[model samples]
Target chain A: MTWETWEREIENYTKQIYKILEESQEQQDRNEKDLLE
Target chain B: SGIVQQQNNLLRAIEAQQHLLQLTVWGIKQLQARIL
Candidate 1:
């Protein structure tokens, strides 16, 4: 595998991790808003 | 194409998807952490 492959792997992983964090945050926010009710 | 430039574009697109994913998850999770 070339450096490109390695780069792609890292990029993909980074992207997935980011998505996980994002989703976590979104859910957290909605729950917070509901608590006010 | 080993275009770092093209890679940069992909980065941005993924970033946006990631952003949306995060916001949506937070909105839902705050409501509850139901596994169902």
Candidate 2:
């Protein structure tokens, strides 16, 4: 399993997950704001 | 494959830094609006 993952370099999802984590944190913070009162 | 690996390798090229390849997964949660 490791060989197959390494051959294709599954790090693409690893990088994507890192990006997605950042975006998730931002989105979470953005949801609580009250605007246009 | 060429430059980034070389740079990261050089940056991590140390006997004591051998454990740097270790990675930790980030936490994720999916919360639907109706659940809130």
Candidate 3:
């Protein structure tokens, strides 16, 4: 693959991972609040 | 508060999961380099 292709692939993977991470962060925040209460 | 102690433990677990996810991303890059 060319450099551009590699860049795009990595970017795609990053976006996918980022979406999951946001969800994880949200869940963590909720869990923390629950523990606090 | 008593909950504060458990909060630290839960935070560590959440951070660990983040690290695991990062490793997975690294693994994908390694595979792409090898295959492509």
Could you say which candidate leads in lDDT? Answer: 3
Over 4 Å off in model 3, which ranges? Answer: B1-36
Q: Model 1: per-residue lDDT, tens digit, B1-36?
A: 224444554566577666556655665775565564
Taking the tens digit of each residue's C-alpha lDDT, what string does model 2 give over A1-37? 7545653554675566557556755544454332212
What would the TM-scores of all predictions be? 0.43, 0.36, 0.47
Model 1, span A1-37: residue lDDT tens: 3446545655665777676566555555656676677
Q: Model 2: clashing residue pairs?
A: none
Sorted on lDDT, highest at the top, how do the candidates line up? Answer: 3, 1, 2
lDDT of each: 0.59, 0.42, 0.65
Q: Could you give the DockQ of candidate 1?
A: 0.02
TM-score of chain B of each: 0.61, 0.32, 0.73
| Tens-place lDDT digits, model 2, residues B3-30 | 4345435544531242333222111112
Q: Interface Cα RMSD for candidate 3?
A: 7.0
Residue A17 in candidate 3 has what lDDT?
57
TM-score of 2: 0.36
Q: Whose lDDT is higher: candidate 1's or candidate 3's?
A: 3
